[PDB]
Design a protein around this ligand. Sequence first.
Ligand SMILES: NC(=O)C1=CN([C@@H]2O[C@H](COP(=O)(O)OP(=O)(O)OC[C@H]3O[C@@H](n4cnc5c(N)ncnc54)[C@H](O)[C@@H]3O)[C@@H](O)[C@H]2O)C=CC1
Ligand SMILES: NC(=O)C1=CN([C@@H]2O[C@H](COP(=O)(O)OP(=O)(O)OC[C@H]3O[C@@H](n4cnc5c(N)ncnc54)[C@H](O)[C@@H]3O)[C@@H](O)[C@H]2O)C=CC1
Ligand SMILES: O=CNC1CCCCC1
Ligand SMILES: O=CNC1CCCCC1
Ligand SMILES: [Zn+2]
Ligand SMILES: [Zn+2]
Ligand SMILES: [Zn+2]
Ligand SMILES: [Zn+2]
Lengths: 374, 374
Amino acid sequence: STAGKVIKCKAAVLWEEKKPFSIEEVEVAPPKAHEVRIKMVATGICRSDDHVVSGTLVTPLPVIAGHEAAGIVESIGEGVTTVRPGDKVIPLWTPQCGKCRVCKHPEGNFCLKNDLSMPRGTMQDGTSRFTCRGKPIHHFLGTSTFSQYTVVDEISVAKIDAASPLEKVCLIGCGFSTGYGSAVKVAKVTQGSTCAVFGLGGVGLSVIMGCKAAGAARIIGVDINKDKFAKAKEVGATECVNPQDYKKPIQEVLTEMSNGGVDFSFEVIGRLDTMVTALSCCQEAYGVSVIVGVPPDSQNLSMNPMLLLSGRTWKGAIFGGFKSKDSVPKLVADFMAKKFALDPLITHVLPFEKINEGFDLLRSGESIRTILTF
Amino acid sequence: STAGKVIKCKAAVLWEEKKPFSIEEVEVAPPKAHEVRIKMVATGICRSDDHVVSGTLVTPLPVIAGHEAAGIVESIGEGVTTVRPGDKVIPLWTPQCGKCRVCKHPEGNFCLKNDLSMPRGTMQDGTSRFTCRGKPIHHFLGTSTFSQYTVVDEISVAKIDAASPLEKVCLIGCGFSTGYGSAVKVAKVTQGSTCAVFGLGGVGLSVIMGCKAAGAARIIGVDINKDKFAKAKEVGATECVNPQDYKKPIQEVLTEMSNGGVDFSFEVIGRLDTMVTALSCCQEAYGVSVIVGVPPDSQNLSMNPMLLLSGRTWKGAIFGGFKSKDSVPKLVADFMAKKFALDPLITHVLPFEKINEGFDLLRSGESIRTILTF
Ligand SMILES: NC(=O)C1=CN([C@@H]2O[C@H](COP(=O)(O)OP(=O)(O)OC[C@H]3O[C@@H](n4cnc5c(N)ncnc54)[C@H](O)[C@@H]3O)[C@@H](O)[C@H]2O)C=CC1
Ligand SMILES: NC(=O)C1=CN([C@@H]2O[C@H](COP(=O)(O)OP(=O)(O)OC[C@H]3O[C@@H](n4cnc5c(N)ncnc54)[C@H](O)[C@@H]3O)[C@@H](O)[C@H]2O)C=CC1
Ligand SMILES: O=CNC1CCCCC1
Ligand SMILES: O=CNC1CCCCC1
Ligand SMILES: [Zn+2]
Ligand SMILES: [Zn+2]
Ligand SMILES: [Zn+2]
Ligand SMILES: [Zn+2]
């Protein structure tokens, strides 16, 4: 009964930095040309959503955040052809326009139509579909999933298996895919190798899954919260180390353990020091280090370039290097085919109304992923 | 006549930093077990040898530098099996012991027996085979080619084509292979790509040859010495730019020229700033940047890791990524087969006695490579 009409629904609005989310009534406009309105069913709480709160990730406010989710299309705008009302879909915070230089590149995935590099907080047309208390509200990465209904550009949505469990596959919208791809696609982990994974949250655990799927023989988790070790080992870690427990730099500990350095290392936290530690801990002649974590805004790191001259490779990636629209449905099909697991990542399931409690669990280190159900 | 006997011959000894080399009479001991004494025929002047003089590269003094050379085996020590007296050889300043974890890796080449990371200035056994005026003199990178005769460990020498032109193939000992490999092996340049090469000396020009051999469609040379542009174009550069010509930083110029960044960039100079510039000038989502240049001893650079998070790859290599003993003979064979050219890199040929003049030519910007003949 909503097609072609404004919808009034509940959403979590962040009015300013460093404040809790405010559950409010918002008004969601119907979709314009090449836009899709989606009924959200489940959304995950990613550390990147917290970065918005903390100021680590600068984006226009007030905003409706959220970028890891899954739902059902409610209606479509003029000219849409990739989805229809009723389809199961996952919003793509990294779009895939299919026409830019990156999209046409065989490897690149950071589409030039993204709203991450210089955020505008809007739809591709430069406007907003949301109003709250008479005020237009900004969008987030073109997705804004912390709302019962959202509107997204066609290039930022993927159709998925009609049989998918939305409360699980929302993870494929961000956390899982990012981590998993960082291992199998960006780093290209090899059979029998030794890997080090710094950070054992939702993304890091997905990195471990990817290292295991690639055939790694040894996987070392690194985290200051030891309650994360058990889960890290269940998904593939052979060993875990806690930097707080040691008298010397963890890079020396990891280098000794691995008889001279690891094959592949991953920074999945978001700290300058751990980015350099991760690079240093890989074998100097052939090691590969991938940065996944997001540091805070603007601050530069200092490092010795001879760490690279010796032969190391250092790189980073968005969304695990996956071309979004092409990949998401394939990942869901692999999940349905039982090629990987998502349950281990989920520690909590809460109603959407408890979003702030979900963020509390993240900050306190008591959760991996909290899935919010609408 | 000389086997098993001390040889008295001329060599260039560097007694102190920032001094001219001193032509001296030195005593060269016969080879000990698993060592090989070689009569040098030709040696090139590489910027790395100048780094020893300038203090850019710290290594024990006094020393006999030189590492880009070709010669003929004069005698061998007990147990040697890979070369015989009379064989044409090229000394290897990166060894290949064949036994360490790097030598056994399919890609890595920075053998753990190198004398580059933590230089001792000696043979593998920790002693020296050179005496001058009764004082022991240090070796350099296990090669010490600035002497009529040198002694090298077996893992630091490769036999080559008996008909090879030693005054040309010496370049394969360093400059050419480093640049060529950095493009074809380390960067893995792709057909139709756009490359940027920072530094148009012997190594940078070799990088251009590798980019051309890889099929690059566009190659932009960057040097503050415009006198190098004609040769750069001769070997494959489509364009050349001089940063001194511009008010804008060179990365902005390069990014604009390449419609958003190059595919592959190479720093072949040895400056911290240029390393970051080169990285920044490659495409943000899929660009690759390789560091080849050597900066002053132990100095760190400052950079924003968001440069990598977007998807850039940053790496470095020693000797073009080539496993030394395995590759050098193959490279010589390729040269003999006309698969690449070495002449365009040689601007001057001088007697060894004029070593200082050759270093002067390098520092003034008049030469690409000077070859010293004994
Ligand atoms: N590159 C991409 O495309 C994306 C990047 N990210 C970023 O990846 C990072 C991780 O994301 P989540 O897993 O959601 O975060 P999380 O907060 O769930 O996990 C972070 C882990 O790092 C641990 N940690 C914190 N400080 C540490 C330290 N000094 N030393 C060792 N361990 C430490 C924490 O105890 C925690 O377990 C975040 O920065 C996020 O913004 C998130 C997904 C996509
Ligand atoms: N990674 C490895 O295995 C090896 C590293 N190297 C290093 O490669 C570098 C190049 O070696 P060569 O070709 O022999 O040196 P070179 O002195 O012949 O050439 C260097 C070029 O850089 C230019 N240049 C200087 N400052 C510049 C600036 N701000 N901007 C743009 N261009 C500038 C110079 O005019 C010159 O043409 C040296 O640092 C050397 O030590 C040398 C070979 C092996
Ligand atoms: O978490 C999802 N997206 C992230 C990607 C890295 C920059 C912060 C936003
Ligand atoms: O130039 C020859 N060898 C180089 C290798 C890189 C550090 C300086 C010495
Ligand atoms: Zn996320
Ligand atoms: Zn695109
Ligand atoms: Zn050299
Ligand atoms: Zn070795």
